[PDB]
Paper text:
In eukaryotes, primers are generated by the heterotetrameric DNA polymerase α-primase (pol-prim) complex, which possesses two enzymatic activities in two distinct active sites. Primase, a DNA-dependent RNA polymerase, generates the initial hybrid RNA-DNA primed substrate, which is then handed off to DNA polymerase α (pol α) to extend the initial primer by approximately twenty DNA nts. Human DNA primase is composed of catalytic (p48) and regulatory (p58) subunits. The regulatory subunit has a C-terminal domain (p58C) that is unique to higher eukaryotes and contains a [4Fe4S] cluster.
To test if the differences between the p58C266-456 and p58C272-464 structures were a by-product of the differences in sequence, we produced, purified, and crystallized a p58C construct containing residues 266–464 in the conditions used to crystallize p58C272-464. With these residues omitted, density for residues in extended conformation that together formed a beta-type interaction were clearly evident in the p58C266-464 2Fo-Fc map. As previously observed for p58C272-464 under these conditions, crystallized as a dimer, with a disulfide cross-link between the two Cys449 residues and several stabilizing interactions between symmetry-related molecules. In p58C266-464, residues 330–340 and 353–360 in chain A and 330–345 and 353–359 in chain B are missing due to disorder. A best-fit superposition of the two structures reveals they are very similar, with a backbone RMSD of only 0.23 Å. This finding shows that the differences in residues Leu318-His351 evident from comparing the previous p58C structures are not intrinsic to the differences in the N-termini of the constructs but rather to differences in the crystallization conditions. Analysis of the p58C266-464 and p58C272-464 crystal structures reveals that substantial crystal lattice packing interactions stabilize this region in both structures. Specifically, Leu318-Gln329 are seen to interact extensively with the same region in the adjacent molecule in the lattice. In addition, on both sides of this extended interaction, Phe326 completes a hydrophobic pocket in the adjacent molecule, providing an additional anchor between the two molecules.
Residue numbers in the entry:
A (entry chain A): 270 to 329, 341 to 353, 361 to 457
B (entry chain B): 272 to 330, 346 to 353, 359 to 457
């Protein structure tokens, strides 16, 4: 067992926006609805981690849940197209793809909170207007890693993670 | 404690780290080059290799979840191009540093098919060490194309974990 706050830095450095938002929502709300638990949990599964949900003894608003991580040593982790094209999030949901599912003004605010430069935000929003969600995410990747070219064709959040970790490990 | 990742090593470690895990299990020790290569690889997956000491004794390897020094894991080119292993050293890259006959025997013990071993040895003879390792990856995971360009052992591990948990 491992605390869920241990991967805060990893989430900011290597998670794609779809999983970064879900980690943040889990940390702040102490719970995710089923759509988020599936998207984020299966993403963690693809890295070799087991998300675990627990109910606290004092639960008879705070729903009384506690989430943690455990290192793993038959649900398939979601691809980009599955996240973008299926299961659009309702108002209680934090899952989905921010480039496809966030209102553009809210998306701009979100990218600003991520410290993306104004030019990068402009390029990303341009790509979003063309419905090129994964290309916009490749742009996000390039901005957050300070590289000119991501060097791969993005089609999976876990692929995003592996390529980010490759860059970070030299 | 280290025996827990034997299976993990057979399924997800690249040959360079699989050989170091085997050597640690069998010799109960690694020299500094091997400890660095393997330990930094393990740190990158979230594990801390350490030796146990009794605190009450006045002046055995295990692993623990990681939870002061540069922990950056070695890349393929750093392993391949520097620190060639001496006898007694188990570090390095098997595609670059193992005699081809020993590499073929090792791949046989890894249950690679004869045709796959032939492909790998052809690539090694051309000095395409990372491409040979990509081919190894494709064989042990039964996939047509690995779908990535390999230049880091921890990247090998990450893509393997994607497939095994896919
Ligand atoms: S493009 Fe793919 S990886 Fe990027 S945020 Fe959208 S679903 Fe996630
Ligand atoms: S090519 Fe890289 S990952 Fe593969 S065995 Fe050699 S050093 Fe390890």
């Amino acid at each position: 067992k491992i605390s869920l706050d241990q991967i805060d830095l990893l989430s900011t450095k290597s998670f794609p926006p779809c999983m970064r938002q879900l980690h943040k929502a889990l940390r702040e709300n102490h719970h995710l609805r089923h759509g988020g638990r599936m998207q984020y949990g299966l993403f963690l599964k693809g890295i070799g981690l087991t998300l675990e949900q627990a109910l606290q003894f004092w639960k008879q608003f705070d729903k009384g849940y506690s989430y943690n991580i455990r290192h793993s040593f038959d649900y398939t982790p979601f691809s980009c197209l599955k996240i973008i094209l299926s299961n659009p999030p309702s108002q209680g949901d934090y899952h989905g793809c921010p480039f496809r599912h966030s209102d553009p003004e809210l998306l701009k605010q979100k990218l600003q909170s991520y410290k993306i430069s104004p030019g990068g935000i402009s390029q990303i929003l341009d790509l979003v207007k063309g419905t090129h969600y994964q290309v916009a995410c490749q742009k996000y990747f390039e901005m957050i890693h300070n590289v000119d070219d991501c060097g791969f064709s993005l089609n999976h959040p876990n692929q995003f993670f592996c390529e980010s970790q490759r860059i970070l490990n030299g």
